[PDB]
C-alpha cells in the first residue's frame, strides 16, 4: 500500500492511513506501523486525538472497557479490555 490504504506492517504516521484505522507502536519513541483493531478480551485504547495508538481500538460490537473519564489517560494511556458491552 503507499500513503493511504496501508496494510498492516506498513509504516504509519497517522491511523487513517491504515486500512485498520490503527497506527500503533509499543512505546513512545517507536516506529508507528499499521496494526490490528483489538478483539474481544484483548487490551485496547478508546479512540484518541493524538493520531497513533499504543493499544488499538476494538472490533465492532465491542467496547474498550476501562477508565476513560480521566484527562491524562485522555492523553495517551486510556487503556481497557474489549468487552461486548
Amino acid at each position: 500500500g503507499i500513503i493511504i490504504n496501508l496494510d498492516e506492517g506498513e509504516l504509519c504516521l497517522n491511523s487513517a492511513q491504515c486500512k485498520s484505522n490503527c497506527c500503533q507502536h509499543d512505546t513512545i519513541l517507536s516506529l508507528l506501523r499499521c496494526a490490528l483493531k483489538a478483539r474481544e478480551n484483548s487490551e485496547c485504547s478508546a479512540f484518541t486525538l493524538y493520531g497513533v495508538y499504543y493499544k488499538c481500538p476494538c472490533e465492532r460490537g465491542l467496547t474498550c472497557e476501562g477508565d476513560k473519564s480521566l484527562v491524562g489517560s485522555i492523553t495517551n494511556t486510556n487503556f481497557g479490555i474489549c468487552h461486548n458491552v
Binding site: 498492516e8 506492517g9 509504516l11 516506529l31 474481544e40 460490537g61
Partner: protein
C-alpha cells in the same frame, strides 16, 4: 572436460550439466579449495557457538556430535554464508524440541560469485556433504537414515547432490524453495527430485517466473510432498513498500534481505516456525489453489493433512506418491501458523444487504471476527466460508455473530443467525443456535446445540 579432485571425484561439463536449453554455458565447479565448505556444528550442548568439524575421526571425536541423535544439515543458497542467523536459528528452534546435531554448511567461498558459477559450485557442496555422511557410516557406523539435509534455494539442489551421491539412502531432504534458474525443467541428475532421498518434501514460496517476474524459486514439483503456502507464488507480508520492508521489526539486514528476496526467503521462516507450531501448518490436498480458495478442499482427509515443514515426515502417506500437492495459508509476519475453520451461517430476520461476521470461542482462546458473506442477506439462506484463524481456539464453546451495512436503512432492520456450524480441519462439527435477531453492529452470541 573433467576436473577431478581428491575425496570428491571428477566433475565434467558434459550434458546434462552443461549444453542443454536450460543450462547453455559449459562451466565447471570450482574448487574444492575455493568453494571451501565447512561444517559448523551446533548441538544442545553447544547451542550458541558452533565448533567447526570435518570428515575425520579426531574432529567428530573432539566435538559434541553424538551418533545417538539425528543430524540435520542446513545448506544456504546464493550469496549467503553458513554463519547467517537463519541457519543458527533453525538450530535454536530445533533444540526446543530435540537433541540433534545441527550442522550448518557454509560454502560462501563458492556462493558470493556470479549466479551461473554458484549453480555449478553446488556440485562441490553436494559432493562435500555426501563424503561427510559416507564417513559417519564408515567410521562410526551412523546410518544415512538419521541424516536430514535442509537446503534453501541453490542449497536445495546441493542437498539433492548429497542424496544422489548417497543414492537415496539419506533420511530426507527438505528443499526450501529450490532455485529455478538452471534447474527447473532439467533432469533428476542435475536436480532435487524425489529419488535423491528416502523422503523429499518441498515448500514452494516464489513460483513465479524468474523472467519476467523475478520469481527465484521453482513452480515444478520436485518432492514426495510439495507444499504451496498461499499458493506458492506470492507471500503475505511481501508487498510492503520498500521503506517499511527495509526498516523491519528489527533488522535493516533482515529488511534488506526481504526487499531483495521476501517470498523466496519466506520458505525458511515457515520451516523455522513449524518447529515449534506442530499442528499450525496443516496441508490440504487440492487440484489447485484456486479450488482450495473456492472452499472445496476442506477438511483434511481421514488420513490427515501433512504439516508443511518440520513435521511433514510424520505424514503416513508421505512416500506413497511423488509430487503430491498440498495447499494451505500462513501469516503475513511471524508466527506464520494459522488454523483454518469452515463456518456455515443460516440467516434469519429481514432481507437486508450487509456483511456478516463471525467470532469463535473455545477453551484455548477466541478470535478476530472473520467475514463469511457480504451481499443480499436473505432469511433462511445459508452462507459458508473457510478462514485461517490465527488462534486454535480449542473446542468450541460459543460463536458470536455481527453484521453491518454501508447505508443506514430507517426501517431499523434486524438480522440474526438461527444456526451457525463450525467444522474444524479434522471435521469436528460444532452446532450453535439462537432465536434472536440483532441490529447493525450489535453482537449476537449463539450458544451450544
Amino acid at each position: 572436460k573433467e576436473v577431478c579432485y581428491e575425496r570428491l571425484g571428477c566433475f565434467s561439463d558434459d550434458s546434462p550439466w552443461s549444453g542443454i536449453t536450460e543450462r547453455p554455458l559449459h562451466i565447471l565447479p570450482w574448487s574444492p579449495k575455493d568453494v571451501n565448505t565447512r561444517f559448523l556444528l551446533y548441538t544442545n550442548e553447544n547451542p550458541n557457538n558452533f565448533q567447526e568439524v570435518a570428515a575425520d575421526s579426531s574432529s567428530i571425536s573432539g566435538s559434541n556430535f553424538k551418533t545417538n541423535r539425528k543430524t540435520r544439515f542446513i545448506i544456504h543458497g546464493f550469496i549467503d554464508k553458513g554463519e547467517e542467523n537463519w541457519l543458527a536459528n533453525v538450530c535454536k528452534n530445533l533444540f526446543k524440541v530435540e537433541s540433534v546435531n545441527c550442522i550448518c554448511v557454509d560454502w560462501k567461498g563458492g556462493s558470493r560469485t556470479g549466479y551461473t558459477q554458484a549453480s555449478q559450485n553446488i556440485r562441490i557442496v553436494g559432493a562435500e556433504v555426501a563424503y561427510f555422511v559416507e564417513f559417519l557410516q564408515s567410521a562410526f557406523g551412523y546410518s544415512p537414515s538419521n541424516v536430514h539435509v535442509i537446503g534453501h534455494s541453490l542449497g536445495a539442489h546441493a542437498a539433492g547432490e548429497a542424496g544422489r551421491r548417497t543414492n537415496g539412502t539419506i533420511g530426507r531432504i527438505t528443499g526450501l524453495d529450490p532455485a529455478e534458474p538452471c534447474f527447473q525443467g532439467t533432469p533428476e541428475l542435475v536436480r532435487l527430485d524425489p529419488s535423491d532421498a528416502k523422503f523429499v518434501d518441498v515448500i514452494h514460496t516464489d513460483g513465479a517466473p524468474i523472467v519476467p517476474n523475478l520469481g527465484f524459486g521453482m513452480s515444478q514439483v520436485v518432492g514426495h510432498l510439495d507444499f504451496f503456502p498461499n499458493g506458492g507464488v506470492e507471500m503475505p507480508g511481501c508487498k510492503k513498500n520498500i521503506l517499511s520492508q527495509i526498516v523491519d521489526i528489527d533488522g535493516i539486514w533482515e529488511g534488506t534481505r526481504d526487499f531483495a528476496a521476501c517470498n523466496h526467503l519466506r520458505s525458511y521462516k515457515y520451516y523455522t516456525d513449524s518447529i515449534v507450531n506442530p499442528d499450525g501448518f496443516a496441508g490440504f490436498p487440492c487440484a489447485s489453489y484456486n479450488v482450495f480458495t473456492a472452499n472445496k478442499c476442506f477438511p483434511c482427509p481421514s488420513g490427515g493433512c501433512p504439516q508443511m515443514g518440520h513435521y511433514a515426515d510424520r505424514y503416513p502417506g508421505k512416500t506413497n506418491d511423488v509430487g503430491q500437492k498440498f495447499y494451505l495459508d500462513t501469516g503475513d509476519a511471524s508466527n506464520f501458523a494459522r488454523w483454518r475453520y469452515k463456518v456455515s451461517v443460516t440467516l434469519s430476520g429481514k432481507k437486508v444487504t450487509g456483511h456478516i461476521l463471525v467470532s469463535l470461542f473455545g477453551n484455548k482462546g477466541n478470535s478476530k471476527q472473520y467475514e463469511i458473506f457480504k451481499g443480499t442477506l436473505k432469511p433462511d439462506s445459508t452462507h459458508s466460508n473457510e478462514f485461517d484463524s490465527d488462534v486454535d481456539v480449542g473446542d468450541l464453546q460459543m460463536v458470536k455473530f455481527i453484521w453491518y451495512n454501508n447505508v443506514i436503512n430507517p426501517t431499523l432492520p434486524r438480522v440474526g443467525a438461527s444456526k451457525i456450524i463450525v467444522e474444524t480441519n479434522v471435521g469436528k462439527q460444532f452446532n450453535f443456535c439462537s432465536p434472536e435477531t440483532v441490529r447493525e453492529e450489535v453482537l449476537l452470541t449463539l450458544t451450544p446445540c
